[PDB]
Design a protein around this nucleic acid. Structure first.
Ligand code: ZN
Ligand code: ZN
Ligand code: ZN
Length: 121
RNA sequence: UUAG
């Protein structure tokens, strides 16, 4: 429901699974629900984990299967890129480059980077 | 250790 506000994105983005499994979903940032394990995000309200990647999952530059961390959902490290990008300490912390260049961002309300200060009224 |  409240996807248009950043506070809700923070609390809920890819916390839950997409109703529709067909390929109609662009299967990425455009859908606020998760489609696989590598897309999944533990809600930071239920699970307290650090911004840093779990090295049992992230080997170098590749995010791998989050299973194969023997810690499971109790791991105090991020298990997916989504978990990191939308971490309370990471989210909107850095200027969105696409917005700074073009004046528009394709990821829109699901960009994990900062856009421009909105006016209040 | 943010660039999907
Ligand atoms: Zn979906
Ligand atoms: Zn782990
Ligand atoms: Zn953006």
């Amino acid at each position: 429901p409240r996807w248009q506000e950043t506070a809700y994105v923070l609390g809920n983005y890819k916390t839950e699974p997409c109703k529709k499994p067909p390929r109609l979903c662009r299967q990425g940032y455009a859908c606020p629900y998760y489609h696989n394990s590598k897309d999944r995000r533990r809600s930071p309200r239920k699970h307290k984990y650090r911004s840093s990647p779990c090295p049992n999952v992230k080997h170098g530059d590749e995010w791998g299967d989050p299973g194969k961390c023997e810690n499971g959902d109790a791991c105090q490290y991020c298990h997916t890129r989504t978990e990191q990008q939308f971490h309370p300490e990471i989210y909107k912390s850095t200027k969105c480059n696409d917005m700074q260049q073009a004046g528009s961002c394709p990821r829109g309300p699901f960009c994990a980077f900062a856009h421009i200060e909105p006016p209040p009224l």
